[PDB]
Ligand binder design. Structure first.
Ligand code: CU1
Ligand code: CU1
Ligand code: CU1
Ligand code: CU1
Ligand code: CU1
Ligand code: CU1
Ligand code: CU1
Ligand code: CU1
Ligand code: CU1
Length: 468
């Protein structure tokens, strides 16, 4: 009796070379209770916008909410002016158009709001969509590619609800400290759905769309997952894993084997992050049921996928230090609240500017620095002196991780990424920005634990000129 997995529509340009996105409020049902929800072209979540490398598209965005919002293309390398950070306000009842000139490798990216101080609430209410970038190279690989049959997006999110059935979002001292988390897991908006998949190989495009919760994917019968792509695109070869940790905002594409008369579940395993192994997440928790079917499939697991360029020489590059911090009093009170409500299981395994980078809370009208254009830079990001998890994301770039929180990156994490783990230690990434970003439409760099972002842990930076 499980509902079928909802499939976002795959949306391409029309004869005018446009795509229309409407942002609005509607209603959804969760376990027989109605909730007010927000969506793109719909009442919850959104479509998957399909783009080709080297082709321009124009996106018309209609805000039919009664409050301001913005639309950011997470993972897509575009100029500040169309990046849709906090300065890209779309008035309630208004329309903004952006032209996107796609110039990066095939990848699964996504889109969501970036309204200043309110991003967590707007994502919790339901706003998220997907971007599918294709190029010439990926289409020659004979990967599974029937959308909604053997090539399927999997957007995983937690929410909590009040007794009246509404989504229960509060930015308070506990949530500003540890993040907004809940007791109900959704998969493309549904609770424990089933997906009917052809015998052979199934391609899952995994997105952790949670506000604050880290995930760790595995299968019910321990069959392996073959990682084929990260945030910014294909890896050089598939990497076989028994489990796959995924931070907030991260994407991975995996292939899994589907065999006759053997259903299995995709699950998430308990994580060690504060607050996130509370019941029902103290044990392995189901995400979706895979049901084998006997319709045609042509997809395969290739020996080779692509080629990564060599990491450049590190001598001579500009180094930028980014020190993350949390107000000791916020940490104090939030942790105490968490302990009092839930006890030891919560540790298993004015705060509106309390969270900072280099001693400064986000200033929308003062960028912290100007980065070079077209030149490699080394950015060193530290959570030393703090216990919380900071998945650190940088707009405008796909980067390479040199060191991740005390160690070289795992093989499946060594390709193109837009997020890096920072948690009580220091990480180092190699970045290059191909496009301009002025003071009036600056690039953001921030923790993707959304409650931290909303209470100050973000900076603006410009990109202007390069070598002179
Ligand atoms: Cu994002
Ligand atoms: Cu982003
Ligand atoms: Cu602002
Ligand atoms: Cu206090
Ligand atoms: Cu204290
Ligand atoms: Cu604690
Ligand atoms: Cu903290
Ligand atoms: Cu550009
Ligand atoms: Cu962002």
């Amino acid at each position: 009796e499980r509902p079928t997995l909802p499939i976002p529509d795959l949306l391409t340009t029309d004869a005018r070379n446009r795509i229309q996105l409407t942002i609005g409020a509607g209603q959804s049902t969760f376990g027989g209770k109605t909730a007010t929800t927000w969506g793109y072209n719909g009442n919850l979540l959104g479509p998957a916008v399909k783009l080709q490398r080297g082709k321009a598209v124009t996106v018309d965005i209609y805000n039919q909410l009664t409050e301001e919002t913005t639309l950011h293309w997470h993972g897509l390398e575009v100029p500040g002016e169309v990046d849709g950070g906090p300065q890209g306000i779309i008035p309630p009842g208004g329309k903004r158009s952006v032209t996107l000139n796609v110039d990066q490798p095939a990848a699964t990216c996504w889109f969501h709001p970036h309204q200043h101080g309110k991003t967590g609430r707007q994502v919790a209410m339901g706003l998220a969509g997907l971007v599918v970038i294709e190029d010439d190279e990926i289409l020659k690989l004979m990967l599974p590619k029937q959308w909604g049959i053997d090539d399927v997006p999997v957007i995983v999110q937690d929410k909590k609800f009040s007794a009246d059935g509404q989504i229960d979002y509060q930015l308070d001292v506990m949530t500003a400290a540890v993040g907004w988390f809940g007791d109900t897991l959704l998969t493309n908006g549904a609770i424990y759905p089933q997906h009917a998949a052809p015998r052979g190989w199934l391609r899952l495009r995994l997105l952790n769309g949670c506000n604050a919760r880290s995930l760790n994917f595995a299968t019910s019968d321990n069959r392996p997952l073959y990682v084929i792509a990260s945030d910014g695109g294909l890896l050089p070869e598939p990497v076989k894993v028994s489990e796959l940790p995924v931070l907030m905002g991260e994407r991975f594409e995996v292939l899994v084997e589907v065999n006759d008369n053997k259903p299995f579940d995709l699950v998430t395993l308990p994580v060690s992050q504060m607050g996130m192994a509370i019941a029902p997440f103290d044990k392995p928790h189901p995400v979706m049921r895979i049901q084998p079917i006997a319709i045609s499939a042509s997809g395969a697991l290739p020996d080779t996928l692509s080629s990564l360029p060599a990491l450049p020489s590190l001598e001579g590059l500009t180094v930028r230090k980014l020190q993350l911090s949390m107000d000791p009093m916020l940490d104090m009170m939030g942790m105490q609240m968490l302990m009092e409500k839930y006890g030891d299981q919560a540790m298993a395994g004015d705060f509106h500017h309390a969270n900072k980078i280099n001693g400064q809370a986000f200033d929308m009208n003062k960028p912290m620095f100007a980065a070079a254009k077209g030149q490699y830079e080394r950015w060193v990001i530290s959570g030393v002196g703090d216990m919380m998890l900071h998945p650190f994301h940088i707009h405008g770039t796909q980067f390479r991780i040199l060191s991740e929180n005390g160690k070289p990156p795992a093989a499946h994490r060594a390709g193109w990424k837009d997020t890096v783990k920072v948690e009580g230690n220091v990480s180092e990434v190699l970045v290059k920005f191909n496009h301009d970003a002025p003071k009036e439409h600056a690039y953001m760099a921030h923790s993707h634990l959304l409650e931290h972002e909303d209470t100050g842990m973000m900076l603006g930076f410009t990109v202007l000129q390069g070598d002179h």
